[PDB]
Design a protein around this ligand. Structure first.
Ligand code: HEM
Ligand code: HEM
Ligand code: HEM
Ligand code: HEM
Lengths: 142, 146, 142, 146
C-alpha cells in the first residue's frame, strides 16, 4: 500500500506529466494491442482494432482519464474506482491479467515521453500505485 | 519439454482412472465461480446468476467434459502437444475470443478438483507431473493468438 | 477486498479444518519445493529439504500458525501481519511471486484433506484471503 | 524457435546502437530500486539503503554490463538460445541460488531503461521484438532450477 512517500511522488510526476494523458493512452493502448495481441479479444466488436485507431485513440483518453481520477482518489482507490471496477467486471468481465499488461505498457510510454522525470524512485512509487489501481479494479470481480 | 518415464507413467495413469464425465463439470463449474470473469465466454446459459446455478448448468458440464477429452490427445501425443492443439488454439482465439490467461485458471481448478478426488494418492510427485503436463497444454492452447 | 461473506466463509472453513493445520503445512510446504524446486534457493540452508524432512514437518507448523494469525487479523491483514512482512520482505528477501505458489499448494492440500468442506464457495473466499495475505505480507518490500 | 525476419533485424538494430556502459548499470540500478528483493545477491556492495548510492555503486555497474554483454551471446545464437545459456542458467541456480522470477523484473527494467533512450524510436513493434527476445532467453536462464 502507498506510503506518503509514494502518494507524494505519484502526484508530482503526474503533476509533471499529467498534461500528456491523452497521448500516453493512445501510445500505451497501441502498444498493448500490438505487443500483446491476446488483448485484442476485448475489442472484437470494434470496427477495426488497428493500431492507434481513433476509437483506440479516444479510448486512451478514457483509460488515461481513469489514471488522473485514480491520482486524486489515490488516498483510497477501492472507494475511488468502484464504477470502473463495475464496468470492467460485471459488464466486461475483463481478466485481471491485462491490467498488469496495460500497467507495464503505461510505464514504457511515460518512460519514452519523460526519461528525465521518470526516475527510478518515481518508478517504484508509480509502480506500487498502478498495482493498487490494478487491485481496486478487481474489487468487484468475485 | 522432455518427459521422464515416470512422468509419462504418472500422467497415463491419472487420465485413465480419471472419470472424465465427473471431474469435467466439477472443475469448469469451480472455475466460473472462483474466477467469474471466465463466465464471460459462457454467455447464453440461462441460469448462472449464483454459483449453484453454474454448478447445475448443462452447458458447463459439456465443455467441462469436452475439455478432459481434449487432453487425451495430449496424453496420446505427449511430445507433439504444440501441433496437437493447433486448431484448438485458433478456435478459442479468433472465434471463441478466449483469454489465454483463462487457461492457467482452469488448469489450477482441474488440479484442485482432482486432488479432492484423489486424496492422499495425489502425492506431491503426482502433482508435479500433472501440472507440468497441464502447463505444456496451456501454453500451446494460447499459441495462435495473433 | 474481503467481504463480510468472504470473511465468514474463511472463518467457517478455518473452524472445521484448523484442527489439522500442522498436518496441512507439512505437505503444502512439501509440495512447493517439489513442484517448484526453484523455491529451494531459500530453504537450501536447511539440513533437510526432502518431504519427510523434520525441518519441513516443523516449518509447515509455522506457516499455518501464521495463517492461524491471519485469520485472526482478517479485518486488518496489513497490520496483523507486519512482523511477518518485514521478515519475509526485509530479512529473507523472498520474492512476492513465491507467495502465489505455496497458496496454490495450500489450496490443494486443503482440497485433498477436506474435499467436502472445501466448497467452490469456500474456495473463492479462501483464495481472495490468500492473496489478501500475500498483499499484507508484501507491505515491507518497497 | 520461430523468428520472423523483421524481428531479427530489430534485435540487431537495437543491439548495435546500445551503450552497454550506460544502460546496463542503469537497468540493474532500477531493478534493485524497483524490486528491492532482488538486492539479496547484491547486498554488501555499498549502502543499499540508498538509490543515489546504488545508482553509483561500482559493484552494481559492473554486473549490469555482464548482464548486457551476456544477452549479446544470445543475440548471435538466435536459434539455439537455450544451449547457449544453459551454463549461465545452471550457474545462477546452483551457484548463487537466484530466484528466476528475478530474471523477470530485471528484463522489465531493461526494457524500460532501453525505452528511455530510444525514446520515440522504441516502437510498439520494437517493444514486441525486444520483449519476446528477453522472454525467450528467460526460460533459458531459469531452465536448470531443479
Ligand atoms: C488503468 C486501467 C484502466 C482504466 C483507468 C480504464 C478506464 C476505462 C474507462 C474510463 C472506460 C469507459 C469510458 C466511457 O465510456 O466513458 C473503459 C472501458 C473499457 N475498457 Fe478500460 N480501463 C482500464 C483497463 C482496461 C484494460 C486493461 C482493458 C483491456 C484488456 C480495458 C478494456 C476496456 C473495454 C473493453 C471497455 C468498454 C468499451 C470497449 O472497449 O468497447 N480497460 N475503461
Ligand atoms: C483446458 C482448456 C480448454 C480446452 C482443452 C478446451 C476445449 C474446447 C473444445 C475442444 C471446444 C469445442 C468447440 C465448441 O464447443 O464449439 C470448446 C468449446 C468452447 N470453449 Fe473451450 N477449452 C478450454 C478452455 C476454455 C476456457 C477457459 C474458456 C472460457 C472461459 C473456453 C470457452 C469455450 C467456449 C465459449 C466454447 C464454445 C462451445 C459451443 O459453442 O458449443 N474454453 N472448448
Ligand atoms: C502463505 C504465505 C506465508 C506465510 C503465512 C509464511 C509464514 C512464515 C512463518 C510463520 C515463518 C516463521 C519465522 C519466524 O517468525 O520466526 C516463516 C519463515 C520463513 N518463510 Fe514463510 N511464509 C509465507 C510465505 C513464504 C514463501 C512463499 C517463502 C519462500 C518460498 C517463505 C520463506 C520463508 C523462510 C525461508 C523462512 C525462514 C525459516 C527459518 O527460520 O529457517 N515464506 N514464514
Ligand atoms: C537476462 C538475465 C541474466 C543474464 C544473461 C545474466 C548474465 C550473467 C553473467 C554473464 C554473469 C557472469 C559470470 C561470472 O562472472 O562468473 C552473471 C553472474 C551473476 N549473476 Fe547474472 N545475469 C542475469 C540475471 C541475473 C539476475 C536477475 C540475478 C539476481 C540478482 C543475477 C545474479 C548473478 C550473480 C549473483 C552473479 C555472480 C557474479 C560473479 O561472481 O561473477 N543474474 N550473470
Amino acid at each position: 500500500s502507498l506510503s506518503d512517500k509514494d502518494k507524494a511522488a505519484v502526484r508530482a510526476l503526474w503533476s509533471k506529466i499529467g498534461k500528456s494523458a491523452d497521448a500516453i493512452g493512445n501510445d500505451a493502448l497501441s502498444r498493448m494491442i500490438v505487443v500483446y495481441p491476446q488483448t485484442k479479444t476485448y475489442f472484437s466488436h470494434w470496427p477495426d482494432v488497428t493500431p492507434g485507431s481513433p476509437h483506440i485513440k479516444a479510448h486512451g483518453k478514457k483509460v488515461m482519464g481513469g489514471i488522473a481520477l485514480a491520482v486524486s482518489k489515490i488516498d483510497d482507490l477501492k472507494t475511488g474506482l468502484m464504477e470502473l471496477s463495475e464496468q470492467h467486471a460485471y459488464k466486461l468481465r475483463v481478466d485481471p491479467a491485462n491490467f498488469k499488461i496495460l500497467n507495464h505498457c503505461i510505464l514504457v510510454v511515460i518512460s519514452t515521453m519523460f526519461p528525465k522525470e521518470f526516475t527510478p524512485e518515481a518508478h517504484v512509487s508509480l509502480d506500487k500505485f498502478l498495482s493498487g489501481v490494478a487491485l481496486a479494479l478487481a474489487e468487484r470481480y468475485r | 519439454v522432455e518427459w521422464t518415464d515416470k512422468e509419462r507413467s504418472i500422467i497415463s495413469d491419472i487420465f485413465s482412472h480419471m472419470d472424465y464425465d465427473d471431474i469435467g463439470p466439477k472443475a469448469l463449474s469451480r472455475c466460473l465461480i472462483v474466477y467469474p470473469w471466465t463466465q464471460r465466454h459462457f454467455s447464453g446459459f440461462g441460469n448462472l446468476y449464483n454459483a449453484e446455478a453454474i454448478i447445475g448448468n448443462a452447458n458447463v458440464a459439456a465443455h467441462g467434459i469436452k475439455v478432459l477429452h481434449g487432453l487425451d490427445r495430449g496424453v496420446k501425443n505427449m511430445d507433439n502437444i504444440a501441433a496437437t492443439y493447433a486448431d484448438l488454439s485458433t478456435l478459442h482465439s479468433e472465434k471463441l475470443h478466449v483469454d489465454p490467461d483463462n487457461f492457467k485458471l482452469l488448469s489450477d481448478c482441474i488440479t484442485i478438483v482432482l486432488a479432492a478426488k484423489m486424496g492422499h494418492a495425489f502425492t506431491a510427485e503426482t502433482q508435479g507431473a500433472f501440472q507440468k503436463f497441464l502447463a505444456v497444454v496451456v501454453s500451446a492452447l494460447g499459441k495462435q493468438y495473433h
